[PDB]
Amino acid sequence: QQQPLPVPPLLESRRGQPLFMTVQRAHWSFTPGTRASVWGINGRYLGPTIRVWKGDDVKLIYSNRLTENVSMTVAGLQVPGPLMGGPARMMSPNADWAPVLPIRQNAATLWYHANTPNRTAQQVYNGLAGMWLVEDEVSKSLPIPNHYGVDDFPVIIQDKRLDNFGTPEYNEPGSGGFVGDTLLVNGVQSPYVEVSRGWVRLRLLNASNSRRYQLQMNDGRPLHVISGDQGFLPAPVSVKQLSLAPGERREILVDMSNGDEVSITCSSILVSTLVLTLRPTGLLPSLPMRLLPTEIMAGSPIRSRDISLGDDPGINGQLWDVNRIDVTAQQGTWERWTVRADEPQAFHIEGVMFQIRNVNGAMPFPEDRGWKDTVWVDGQVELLVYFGQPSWAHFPFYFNSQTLEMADRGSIGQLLVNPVPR
């Protein structure tokens, strides 16, 4: 018998007031199993789901109540380098950080997490992560499920290794990324979610240190993808197996009208491949033919770049160097980036949005044709990157392996985006 899917509380303003985020040990009552502690935001394991609106200027007030330094970031958020932030905006124990974020991007499922240099893998694993939703006029008008915690749920996936009491424990891997043998969704092992007989929206986010998931429905039906690291696809895409690498987000719609139960499923070997069970209640209450009003146009790349990742920490043969700018781009411009990895892993770029143009010389799958900020690289990919945000030498954007331990080990590069205007 599984436990109910925990629904992170929705944290939004509306009154132009600040969103308070206290990084702290989770309450025992939110901690599994019953001995070791875990972390989160505001007393929870993991954090609340933030919801903001395109056009808002949101005041975030972070407070660090942990015994070590913590820097927090919103992955996929389009803001200037100094607002990201990272090591230059790190919070010492008991200190705070109150940035004002100008939300200007389209609707998307983003996420926030600790990005403390050297401690990212451990801090995210410990529970320093949560979902971040951007809503806009488009998402508000779409005929899709949107009642948060009713027919629209966050699905935060993490693979862990539990101690003798059922509490996730971390052991730094000697090589590569951390891999667990137990799946947790929103902090619970293979939970179920009770839904009515209609469409349900799941916002899938891979918040694991390194594991890449290959998701499918246990009854063989297709997964109807509607987004989108950086937003909606032009129209829904129905796939049999969905890849979800660390840091990727995809929103799917599941039709529970048949009144039957359906589960999403995925050494190294997992104790269970059960991700989330959609348990019908018998209650009664398609999909849209188009999501985005326009399959948005991409610009002409003025330059190309080549990025190489491997089984050894570093990018392009170099470890991350805070003093070194690896790429200098011009804001408002487009570039073609070729990313290669002989050791399969996800790749993330801060301060941009990109469209995958080719995967190993072939077309990318439909679910991968919208705007993104994270990509699974197994061989080579070609990206059409847009630099819509500015950054500065001491507040650069990072591009990195999404394998958390690898990033911690130096698989990070620095991107300077000269401001336009200036």
Author numbering: 30 to 295, 312 to 330, 335 to 471
The authors write:
SufI is a water-soluble, periplasmic protein. The sequence of SufI shows that it is a member of the multicopper oxidase superfamily. The overall structure of SufI is very similar to that of CueO and contains three cupredoxin-like domains. Indeed, access to the region of the structure that forms the active site in multicopper oxidases is blocked in SufI by highly conserved residues. Together, these observations suggest that SufI is neither a copper-binding protein nor an enzyme.
The two molecules of each asymmetric unit are essentially the same within experimental error (rmsds over 408 and 406 Cα atoms of 1.1 and 0.9 Å for the orthorhombic and monoclinic crystals, respectively). Of the two data sets, the orthorhombic crystals diffracted to higher resolution (1.9 Å compared to 2.6 Å). The main areas of difference between the two crystal forms lie between residues 42–47, 55–66 and 326–334. Residues 42–47 are found in a loop that leads into the first domain, while residues 326–334 compose the long linker between domains 2 and 3. The electron density for both of these regions was poor and often missing entirely for the side chains. This suggests that these differences between the two crystal forms arise from flexibility of the molecule in these regions. Residues 55–66 are found in an extended loop in the first domain: a short alpha-helical segment is present in this loop in the orthorhombic form, which is unravelled in the monoclinic form.
